[PDB]
Amino acid sequence: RKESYSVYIYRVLKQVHPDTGVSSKAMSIMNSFVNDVFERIAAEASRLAHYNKRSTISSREIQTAVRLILPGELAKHAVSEGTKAVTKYTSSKKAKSRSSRAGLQFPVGRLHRILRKGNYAQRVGAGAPVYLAAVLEYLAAEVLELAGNAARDNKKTRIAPRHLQLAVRNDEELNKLLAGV
């Protein structure tokens, strides 16, 4: 709900396309993608945890919601990215941030606070925002990878909205995931 991930989308872009930029209008669309996928994942995780034991949203409920919202190959890779971040976070340790402990750019702490604030469940486990951050980061990285490819195919160094449009509508699974947005 109007949350901005622009700084984290930008850092993911520099990992995926180090010498590629993104216009502000294209950044607003990327934020709409992440916010919409977050709301659908959280709403499904909230439904699975409505009468859960202790009404708990953990990485289990996120993972199940991930399989329901995301299409085939996107879901399997998002799942693998989620378990990897939780595994790395579990064995991690100056005081490091939760995202750096999970090897992620998307904010684990803020996503934990947004999940708690939305009242999706009585309790939000520490592993749920780690898993969710890895999924949203993976989805952003996939969209930015193909948008950046479309940008330079158009002989550009800056991702414009039309580069985001073509990247999504020409990928079967990303198009079905983000059609409504």
């Binding site: 901005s4 700084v7 502000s24 941030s97 939760r98 995202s99 904010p107 702490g109 803020r110 606070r113 708690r116 604030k117």
Partner: protein, 267 residues
Amino acid sequence: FQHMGLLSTNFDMIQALPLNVKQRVCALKNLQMKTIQIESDFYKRVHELEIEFEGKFKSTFDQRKAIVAGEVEPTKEQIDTPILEGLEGDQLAELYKAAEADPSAKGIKDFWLTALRTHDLVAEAIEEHDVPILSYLTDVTTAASKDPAGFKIEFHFATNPYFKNQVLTKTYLLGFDPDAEAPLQFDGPHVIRAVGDTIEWEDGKNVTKKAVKLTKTVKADSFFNFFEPPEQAEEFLELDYEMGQAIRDTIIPRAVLFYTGELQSDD
């Protein structure tokens, strides 16, 4: 500070120390208490310095209030200041072209609401039913006192359908001396008491209370519980104080940087 000496990180080394060396450590503990006492006087001088600087800060805060309220117009020098930094190649020009002027829009609407909810710690305390109430916030001020030692934060509200109060006041009484019962623990000013403010809610607008079924009244989550401070109720006071510190030390002096979101956390 670990009050349980047996939980000291180097307890085994301390225990093995010869007796004459132990008594030298005991002298350093005594000297450490004197160092802390001097530190207490330092923090008292800093507190007086903060009081002294209120008059110096006051005109920049006053002008900000007048700008937010629409009581004064920006000057040419102020218009020539970039709304955001780090914009290159016509980016700033296009920003100013994105929305035509609206003469019906006066001052800066929702300035303090936006600033408060962009700070991560204060955002956690703001619920959805607090958002339209904080829209009526016209100013947030803070002042410190020497006797009794502490500070207050005052929230100024325009006439609104939620409560009759113009100003909601939160006051913290601070202790600047070391606890005579635990002198080694002193690490700066500490809270003795938090004093809130009675909110004169209009009918059915009290978002801080709700009934549960006998029928009893319990606390509901709301930012405005900030104005009703209290086993673990002592940590709740420390969390309340930490929010008060963030507002006084960080948000009030740099409000517009939270309004724009130029100040960010990564926690």
